[PDB]
DNA sequence: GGGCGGCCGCCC
DNA sequence: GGGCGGCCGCCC
């Protein structure tokens, strides 16, 4: 279940599940903000690689929330776009 | 279905009437040849668009392929290219140096 | 290095 | 014909 407004977002990338912490993402892409079910932590690009999508080189499209690319979440005000 | 419309259009002219959705514009072949990021399509209000900008203006952003969503005489621009009526624009506006 | 636009094959 | 995901290279 997905609440777009929640501080924690369930995300997927190539079938790998994670939990994204918006507060950590807001600190910039060098901060690990996505935690997988074994407790490990990933930056957005690291999670893109983890999900098999290294070649796409765009975590904003490769990482999904409820099936939506994170880019769509940013476009609709649900997720900060890190500067 | 896949064919063009019934209007007469000269496919060899330097300026082509193009359409995307309901939106009409004029494509300047000489500008398209310069590179894909060059504004080459002028709408009637005078505003200018690149091919992908024109696709978005025409309501076809989701298509992500101006070669099929932009038309001339009903024909997709891909058909115009396949038959030598339209150049395929370069990605960049200069010749790459030996690498 | 990273953002992001362009290409186009594959699906529906 | 609408749709969109995988891939990659241009450039800030």
UniProtKB/Swiss-Prot annotation, chain A:
This antigen is recognized by autoantibodies from patients with primary biliary cirrhosis. The lineage of its organism: Eukaryota, Metazoa, Chordata, Craniata, Vertebrata. It comes from Homo sapiens. It is found in: Nucleus; Nucleus, PML body; Cytoplasm. Component of the nuclear body, also known as nuclear domain 10, PML oncogenic domain, and KR body. May be involved in the pathogenesis of acute promyelocytic leukemia and viral infection. May play a role in chromatin-mediated regulation of gene expression although it does not bind to histone H3 tails. High levels in spleen and peripheral blood leukocytes, much lower levels in tonsils, thymus, prostate, ovary, small intestine, and colon. Very low levels in heart, brain, placenta, lung, liver, skeletal muscle, kidney, and pancreas. Not detected in brain, liver and muscle. Induction: By gamma-interferon. The chain holds residues 582 to 664 of 867 of the full protein. Interacts with PIN1. This is Nuclear body protein SP140. It comes from the Eukaryota. Residues 1-80 form the SAND domain. The gene is SP140.
């Amino acid at each position: 279940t997905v609440d777009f407004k929640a501080p924690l977002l369930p995300v997927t990338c190539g079938g790998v599940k994670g939990i994204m912490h918006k507060k950590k993402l807001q600190q910039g892409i060098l901060v690990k903000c996505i935690q997988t079910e074994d407790g490990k932590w990933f930056t957005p690009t690291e999670f893109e690689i983890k999900g098999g999508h290294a070649r796409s080189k765009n975590w904003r499209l490769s990482v999904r929330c409820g099936g939506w690319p994170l880019r769509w979440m940013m476009e609709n005000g649900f997720l900060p776009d890190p500067p």
